[PDB]
Each structure stands twice: as structure tokens, then as C-alpha cells.
Motif scaffolding. Structure first.
Motif, short mmCIF file in Angstrom:
data_model
loop_
_atom_site.label_atom_id
_atom_site.label_comp_id
_atom_site.label_asym_id
_atom_site.label_seq_id
_atom_site.Cartn_x
_atom_site.Cartn_y
_atom_site.Cartn_z
N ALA A 1 0.85 -1.18 0.00
CA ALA A 1 0.00 0.00 0.00
C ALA A 1 0.88 1.23 0.00
O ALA A 1 1.87 1.29 0.73
N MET A 2 0.54 2.20 -0.83
CA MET A 2 1.27 3.46 -0.91
C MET A 2 0.26 4.58 -1.06
O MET A 2 -0.51 4.59 -2.02
N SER A 3 0.26 5.51 -0.13
CA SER A 3 -0.71 6.60 -0.14
C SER A 3 -0.05 7.88 -0.62
O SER A 3 1.06 8.20 -0.20
N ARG A 4 -0.73 8.59 -1.53
CA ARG A 4 -0.36 9.90 -2.04
C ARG A 4 1.14 10.07 -2.34
O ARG A 4 1.78 10.97 -1.79
N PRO A 5 1.71 9.25 -3.21
CA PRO A 5 3.09 9.47 -3.60
C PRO A 5 3.21 10.64 -4.57
O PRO A 5 2.33 10.89 -5.39
N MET A 6 4.31 11.36 -4.45
CA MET A 6 4.62 12.47 -5.33
C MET A 6 5.98 12.19 -5.96
O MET A 6 6.99 12.16 -5.26
N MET A 7 5.99 11.95 -7.26
CA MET A 7 7.21 11.66 -8.00
C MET A 7 7.40 12.72 -9.07
O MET A 7 6.56 12.87 -9.95
#
Lengths: 25, 25, 25, 25, 25, 25, 25, 25, 25, 25, 25, 25, 25, 25, 25, 25, 25, 25, 25, 25, 25, 25, 25, 25
Positions: H15-21
Motif C-alpha cells: 500500500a502506498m498513499s499519495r506518492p509524489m514523484m
């Protein structure tokens, strides 16, 4: 919210008998 | 919130009998 | 918050009988 | 907060009978 | 020149909240 | 020149909250 | 020149809160 | 020059919430 | 020059909420 | 020059909410 | 919210008897 | 909301007897 | 006969400049 | 005979400049 | 005979400049 | 005879400049 | 005889500039 | 004889500039 | 009962001639 | 019962001549 | 019962001559 | 019963001469 | 019963001479 | 019963000479 992981994987030359997977509640 | 990991993995030449996986509550 | 790890792993030539995994509550 | 580790590992030529893993409460 | 590594990896049954990855400048 | 390593790894049943990774400058 | 190592590793059943990694300058 | 790595990986039961790349600058 | 990697990967039984990916600048 | 990678991947039994992908600038 | 992962994976030369998968509740 | 993953995968030279998949409730 | 080992190892956050490995003669 | 190992390994967040590997003679 | 290993490995968030690999002679 | 390995591997978030691979002689 | 491996691999979010691969002689 | 491997692989979100592949001689 | 481990392992730059593995009786 | 592990592993830059694996009896 | 693992693995830049695998009896 | 694993795997830049695989008896 | 795995896999830049696969008896 | 896997796979830039596959008995 509630970002919830499930089941991810690789079965390579493997055996799995009668698995029970419930994704919920 | 509540970022929750599940089950991730590799089964290589392995055996697993009657697994019970519940993702919830 | 509550970033919670689950189960990650590698089974190589291994045996696991009747595992019970509950991801929740 | 509450960054909580789970179970990560490698089983190589190993045996594990009837494990019970609860990730929660 | 400037051979620059980034981010490589495996997430197995894991949780990661709000990651910020910037590849540049 | 400047051969520069980044971030490589394995997360197995692990939790990581709000990581900030900057690859540059 | 300047062969520079970064971050490599294994997180197994571990927890890491708000890491800040800068690869540069 | 400037051979620059990005983000490569595997998410397995994760699970990964709101990543910014951001790949640039 | 400027050979720049992007994002490549596999999501297997995984969850990702509101990702923001910018390939440019 | 400027050979630039985009986004390539596999979503298998996965969920992704409101992704924002910008390929440009 | 509630971004929920399901089941994603690869079965290569593997055997699985009577699996029960419930995606709901 | 409720973005919910289902079942995605590859069966290569594999055998699966009497699977029961319920996507709902 | 002549069972001959080569080079096996792990580089974690490490740097190695201009290695020369010859497996033969 | 002559069972000869080569080069096997993991590079995690690492840098290696101008390696020369010859498997033969 | 002559069973000869080559090069196998994983590069995770790593950088390698101008490698020269010769498999032969 | 002459069973000869080549190059197999994974590049995850990595950078490699001007590799020269010769499989022969 | 002469069973000869070539180049097999995965590039995930990676960059490779001007590779030269010769399979022969 | 001469069973000779070529180039097989996956490019996911990756960039490759001016590759030169020769399968012969 | 009888949860029995097999053979799991990593061969990195290694050589093994004529192994005989029997998993049974 | 009889959950029996097989053979799981990784061969990285390795050589193995004439292996005999029997999974049964 | 009799959940029996087979052979699962990764060959990366490796060589294997005349393997004999019997899955049965 | 008798859930029996077979052979699953990845060959990356590898060589295998005259394999004999029997799935039965 | 008798859920029996076969052969599943990936050949990437690889060579295999005169394989004999029997799925039966 | 008797759910029996066959042969599934991917050949990418690969070579296979005189394979013999028998699905039966």
C-alpha cells in the motif's frame, strides 16, 4: 482513507492446497 | 489514514497447505 | 497515521502447513 | 504516527508448522 | 559524465505513506 | 565522472511513513 | 572520478518514520 | 551526458498513499 | 544527451492512492 | 537528445485512485 | 476512500487445489 | 470511493482445481 | 574436475571504481 | 569437467565506474 | 564439459559507468 | 559441450552509460 | 554443441546510453 | 550445434539512446 | 504432520558439479 | 499431512553441471 | 494431503548442462 | 489430495543443455 | 485429486538445446 | 480429478533446438 494492500506474489514450481482468501469486512 | 500492508512474497519450490488469509476488519 | 507493515517474504524450498494470517482489527 | 513493522523474512530449506500471525488491534 | 542512480526496490507486504521522490536538479 | 549511487533496497513486511528522497543537486 | 555510494539495504519487519535522504550536492 | 535513473520497482501486496514523484529539473 | 529514466514497475495485488507523477521540466 | 522514459507497468488485481500523470514540460 | 488491493500474481509450473477467493463485504 | 482490486494473474503450465471467486458484497 | 568459484557478493551503499575481473586461463 | 563460476551479485544504491569483465580464455 | 557461469545480478538504485563484459575466448 | 552463460539481470532505478557487451569468440 | 546465452533482463525506470551489443563471432 | 541466445527483455518506463545490436558473425 | 524442509539457497559466482538431490522416501 | 519442501533458489553468475533432482517417492 | 514443492528459481547469467528433473513417483 | 508443484522459473541470459523433465508417475 | 504443475517460465536471451519434456504417466 | 499443468512460457530473443514435448500417458 484506508489504503489496504491485498495479496501479490509469485508461485514458481510451488504447490498450495485449499487456500482461503477473504478481501473484505 | 491507515496505510496497511498486506501479503507480498515469492514461493519458489515451496509447499503451503490450507492457508487462511483475511484482509479486513 | 498508522502506517502498518504486513507480511513480506521469500519461501525457497520450504514448507508451511495451515498458516493463519489476519491483516486487520 | 504509529509506524509499525510487520513480519519480513527469508525461509530457505526450512519448515514451519501452523503459524499464527495477527497484524492488528 | 554524471551516471546517477535513482530508486529501485521491492515492496513486499509493506506500507509507505506520502512518499516524496524528486529525481532532478 | 561522478558515478553516484541512489537508493536500492527491499522492504519486506515493513512500514515507512512520509519519506523524502531527493536525487539531485 | 568521484565514485560515491548511496543507500542500499534490507528492511525486514522494521519501521522507519519520516526519513530524509538527499543524494546530491 | 547525464544518464539518470528513475524509479523502478515491484509492489506486491503493498500500500502506498499519495506518492509524489517528479522526474525533472 | 540526457537519457532519463521514468517509472517502470509491477503492481501485483497492491493499492496506490492519489499518485502524482510528473515527467518533465 | 533527451531520450525520456515514461510510465510502463502491470496492474494485477490492484487498485489506484485518482492518479495524475503529466508527460511533458 | 478505501483503495483496496485484490489478488495479483504469477503461477508458473504450480498447483493450487480448491481456492476460495472472496472480494467483498 | 471504494476502488477495489480484483484478481489478475498469469497461469503458465499450471493447474487449478475448482476455484471459487466471488467479486461482490 | 576443477570446480572453481567465481565472484559472488552484495554491494550495499558502496562504491567500486574500475574493477578488473578475469574469469579464465 | 571445469565447472567455473562467473559473477553474481546485488548492487543496491551503489556506483561502479568502467568495470571490465572477461569470462573466458 | 566446461559449464561456465556468466554475469547475473540485480542493480537497485545503482549506477554503473562504461562496463565492458566479454563472454568468450 | 561449452554451455556458456551470458548476461542476465535486473536494472531498477539504475543508470548505465555506454555498455559494451560482446557475446562471442 | 555451444549453447550460448545472450542478454536477458528487465529495465525498470532506468537509463542506458549508447549500448553496443554484438551477438556473434 | 551452436544454440545461441539473443536479446530478450522488458523496458518499463525506461529510456535507451542509440543502441547497436548485431546478431551475427 | 511431517512438515519437511527442502533445499533453498543462493549461488552467487559459484560452481557446483554433478549434484544429486532426492526429495522423497 | 506431509507438507514437503522442494528446491527453491537463485543462481547468479553460477554454473551447475548435470544436476539430478527427483521430487517423489 | 501431500502438498509437494517442485523447482522454482531464477537463472541470471548462468549455465546449466544436462539437468535431469523428475517430478513424480 | 496430492497438490504437486512442477517447474517454474526465469532464465535470463542463461544456457541449459539437454534438460530432461518428467512430470508424472 | 492430483493437481499437478507443469513447466512455466521465461527464456530471455537464452539458449536451450534438445529439451525433452514429458507431461504424463 | 487430475488437473494437470502443461507448458506455458515466453521465449524472448532465445533459441531452442529440437525440443520434444509429450503431453499425455
Amino acid at each position: 482513507g484506508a489504503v489496504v494492500g491485498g495479496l501479490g506474489g509469485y508461485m514458481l514450481g510451488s504447490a498450495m492446497s485449499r487456500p482461503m482468501m477473504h478481501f473484505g469486512n
